[PDB]
Amino acid sequence: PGTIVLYAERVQDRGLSAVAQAESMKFKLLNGLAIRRAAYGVVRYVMESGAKGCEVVVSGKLRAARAKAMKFADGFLIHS
Amino acid sequence: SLVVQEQGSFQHILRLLNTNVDGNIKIVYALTTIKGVGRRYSNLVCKKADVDLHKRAGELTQEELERIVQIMQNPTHYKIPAWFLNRQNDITDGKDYHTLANNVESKLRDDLERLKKIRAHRGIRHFWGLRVRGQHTKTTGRRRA
Amino acid sequence: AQHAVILDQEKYDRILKEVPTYRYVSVSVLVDRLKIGGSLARIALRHLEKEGIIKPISKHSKQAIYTRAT
Amino acid sequence: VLKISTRKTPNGEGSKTWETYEMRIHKRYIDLEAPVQIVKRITQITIEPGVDVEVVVASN
Amino acid sequence: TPVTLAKVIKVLGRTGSRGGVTQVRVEFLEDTSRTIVRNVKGPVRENDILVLMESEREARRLR
Amino acid sequence: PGVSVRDVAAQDFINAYASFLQRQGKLEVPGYVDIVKTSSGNEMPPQDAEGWFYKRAASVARHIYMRKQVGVGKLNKLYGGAKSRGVRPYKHIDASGSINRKVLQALEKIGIVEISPKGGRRISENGQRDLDRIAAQTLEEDE
Amino acid sequence: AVPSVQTFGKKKSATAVAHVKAGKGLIKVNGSPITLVEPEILRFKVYEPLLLVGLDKFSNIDIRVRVTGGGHVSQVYAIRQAIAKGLVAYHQKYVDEQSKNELKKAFTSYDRTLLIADSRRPEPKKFGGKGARSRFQKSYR
Amino acid sequence: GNEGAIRDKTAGRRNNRSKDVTDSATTKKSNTRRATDRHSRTGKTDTKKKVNQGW
Amino acid sequence: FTPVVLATPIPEEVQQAQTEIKLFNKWSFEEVEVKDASLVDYVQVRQPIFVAHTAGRYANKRFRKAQCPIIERLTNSLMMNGRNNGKKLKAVRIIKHTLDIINVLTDQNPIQVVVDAITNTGPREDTTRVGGGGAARRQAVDVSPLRRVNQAIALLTIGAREAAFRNIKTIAETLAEELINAAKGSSTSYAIKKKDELERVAKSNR
Amino acid sequence: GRVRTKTVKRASKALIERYYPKLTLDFQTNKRLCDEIATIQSKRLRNKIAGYTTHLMKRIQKGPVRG
RNA sequence: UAAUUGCGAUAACGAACGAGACCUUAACCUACUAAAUAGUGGUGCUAGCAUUUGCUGGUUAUCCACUUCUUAGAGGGACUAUCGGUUUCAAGCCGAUGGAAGUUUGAGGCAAUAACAGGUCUGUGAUGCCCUUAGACGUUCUGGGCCGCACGCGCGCUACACUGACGGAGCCAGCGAGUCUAACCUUGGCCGAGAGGUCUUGGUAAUCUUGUGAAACUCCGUCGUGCUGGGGAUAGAGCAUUGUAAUUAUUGCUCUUCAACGAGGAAUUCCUAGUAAGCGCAAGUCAUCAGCUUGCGUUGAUUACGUCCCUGCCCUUUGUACACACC
């Protein structure tokens, strides 16, 4: 007891936070949104938080039996 | 070593322990064509017999050969360790033998028979013409019997 | 088996009167002269050097080499 | 250098590709002759996340 | 027997389907002022010396 | 000039010392010699038959002279080589600790080596003495 | 303190250090004369520098070398490199330039790398073969 | 039991050795199905409305 | 030769031949010449060498192979057939022995004899499997000098090894036998045979 | 195969364009120049750049070069 | 060009993802900052051999100084540099010299867009739906089984010996790893033919195991071409180790038994420099078991430095009634 201590700490803009933006999609879809609305919104907001670029992939299955994926990018990224 | 000589002395081929033994081989190995005398056994027996291993089967006195046999079939007496022996702890009289020559065939027969007679898996396995030491039998030995 | 494992007195003398002209003598050459196998032929190598003919010009295991005396 | 060398696949199919991770461990020591006051001062501070600082004593 | 020596003066390129052959212009030595094109079998550079086994006869293509 | 053994090539030295320890007659030869192997990693026993314990004695000694201290383990590891595991790959294997340990005890009783602190066996000062001596002798045949 | 340099030699992973000081002319390796060495066939390889540059040369100097690493041939090349490098390092601080450069000349000329270290090294094996380039074996089906 | 097993002729090696070997021993892979891999069996199909609602 | 010595001393013949001439195991590099024009440039001899061992970078460029001393090329080519791959110390010694042997028979710098069996074994012309349509005839070619040396060494050592296999004669002896029989070409050597035949067929198909 | 990527050749172009006096068929100094005069993030890439701009200069000296 | 890498041609100009850059590791720093957990020289304490100085050791501190070697921070270094050939005198390519280094410096890490009904629901307390749910398809306990053997296929290990086996003797690596609320790495001493046993011991580690004295290899012997002393399958008897348990034999040792295999048809794999091949080691797995893997160093070649013949693949042009796209 007392040899361990927790503090919270707001994060300087969730906008450049992969983890935050993923959790945000999770919530958008889970909260019964649209697909492109959710994604394009996350993206437009990440961009708006002044990012160099960003990309959101949704893979799996929506409403139709067969699985599909979708890339939603804007701005600029490097890959290698 | 040395340029040697002799005369009619050495006779090629000579017969001990109910088998035959070629002359003109380096004696230690001659003794090997007998059953139950691996290179080690032969080596130690010859050393115990007080023989010059540099000799062929070739030379060797009759006497010498006699001693060689005596020790070969009475190892424990002429201080040979007993861990050096192919049949320690019989399984009936429990003595230690170094079974030799035409008799090792018998002893194999004997043991295999004991296993079969007692119905032990090893025995059954032998009787069946299979491998007994637990090796996989799918792939190996198919040329076989 | 096919022979050359003893000494047959005639063989010894044979070794003494046949070993000139052998510009090359070795383990192999002695065997090649239809006699002594690489056991006793090695002894022959040691014992022609007892005194005479063979002049030691090379050294070791496998390879030996000698030339006619002068 | 701690290597761990694993198949990439979670299963078995595919050409057998191998992959290898490392954690690099860097260690250092500085020996210092001082009194209690300066050691305690200097070592309560200089604190740093990720750096494991250990202070011993003695000559045995 | 009549040997004939020739010096490689120019390397032309590889022939043969496999492409391990090399066409070369050679100036033979015992009397220059005459050139012939032979086909090699080994690796070859400028100024090597081929023993033309037969002195007059020459090739071109190779499949 | 002055001398060590380091001034003398392995073989002719160790054979010089073999022939010496031999000659001498003081030694200790366990008795199991001739009836014994040298390592589980071996097929046949030594060919020197009468002797070879002198050969290893010499070898061991010189090995210990040429360094601080050495134990039975290190010698087993040294004197050992490849064992054919028949049809399954070769692997290095240590040699016998009896042969060696007994050899040490022998040379020690003969005062040519001594239980060292630190561990193991250090060459004796009288070992230094006698080894430098026959080393010298071996260069003296060569003169 | 007498005049003295240190140098080294390197083939594969073996490394051979030379201490080259003013002396009455020894040439020892680890702790034995440079006459022992054996490898033996390779023995001349280590004599090589001395004979390239005249046996005298070593009369104002003591030479000692110690090799660890590599293996038998590996160590021979390292020690010889260390010795020749040594001799030259010594003529560079104590004798005059022209002498040193005459020595670099006779080594560098004939050579076997004596002054310069061979850069060849192990390449790492990569999964799918017992070696670096060697790939395993396939049957197709 | 074990008495049974040794006493049972119609057992052991010689007996097998003397029997002919079946041809399905020396068979081949099988394969069964592959040029149907792209051809869906489900017989179901999706539909542009459901897909457009989804995606 | 003026002897000299210091602390740890250097043996007689050692000092002697070392500082003077720059010769082999102990054979002359001076004299020794390539009895076939061409082949010079592709048979080394000078710079002279002590033993045929060298951390040689003779591969990283197309032709520099040529520049490697011939004798060492021979020993190199000795150390094959799987079991022997690597094992240059083995090879080198086999060569020292071989040269001693060859020397015994008929004198000559034995390195000169080697040089001769090498000159005397490279095929002046050969053949390749040209198409010309399914039923492939054989177009005669004149072969490079480099290929000639290469193939000469290959042949010599192969025949020497194949001979030596499964009999009492030892590698160096049969290598010397091949070398000798070949040096002054005698159709009792595997090498000379194979050359003669290559050129027989190479004529036969022009 | 030793062929220079765009970024390298582009940079030589621009530099020679705007700093031809200073620069001089010597890599060693053109290098140092590049340090003092432009901002690159790897030694390697900077060298590559200098060496090529050095080449380009070295051949401008004997007639113009397109681009 | 390794590269949509560039030059050049040019209704295009100028750019971005990807390649490149970047990062890691291997190479070079008598320049920098240092070190009893790395080492060198001097000095003391001291052994041996010569003696005329000398030569070779002992001594985790008896002190002094150093940083060449070792360690790892910071820098520096290379840019295919200089010169010359060649090329549309373009990007480039080649040779020579210099150089630690000039094959993308060697080797890796990262790696766009798109595709596949590739494999994985048996890695997951990731998961839809179906099934099952107390005579369980939950779970645990005892015992067996995955190892079963006429035989087809793949990866492998060991061999057919004399560039060798055996026996003395020489004797040299690099990458690792190790015990707290525990029994891990183990030196040394004894006992034991061996395997192993036993008493102590150092180490939570650049400190101790450990210079991991590894194996191929080197040298002096034995054997001598004989299925031989090559080879060591199969099998018998005995001894020990892990484990609650060893039978269908975990593994280790000793004696004995001594097979096929005399270089392997049609076919077919892999490979360009410290590479190939040979050789061992450490790590993973692990109570015990490596003939496997992943890395590591040791010994260290022959042959190309080319092409499109075989095969495979990308690219143009071309045809299409295909577009769920030749399944």
Ligand SMILES: [Mg+2]
């Ligand atoms: Mg990029």
Ligand SMILES: [Mg+2]
């Ligand atoms: Mg027998």
Ligand SMILES: [Mg+2]
């Ligand atoms: Mg060893």
Ligand SMILES: [Mg+2]
């Ligand atoms: Mg040994």
Ligand SMILES: [Mg+2]
């Ligand atoms: Mg490797």
Ligand SMILES: [Mg+2]
């Ligand atoms: Mg590419």
Ligand SMILES: [Mg+2]
């Ligand atoms: Mg004095």
Ligand SMILES: [Mg+2]
């Ligand atoms: Mg004094």
Ligand SMILES: [Mg+2]
């Ligand atoms: Mg430093």
Ligand SMILES: [Mg+2]
């Ligand atoms: Mg150069």
Ligand SMILES: [Mg+2]
């Ligand atoms: Mg790099």
Ligand SMILES: [Mg+2]
């Ligand atoms: Mg499928």
Ligand SMILES: [Mg+2]
């Ligand atoms: Mg899964």
Ligand SMILES: [Mg+2]
């Ligand atoms: Mg489920």
Ligand SMILES: [Mg+2]
């Ligand atoms: Mg799992």
Ligand SMILES: [Mg+2]
């Ligand atoms: Mg998960």
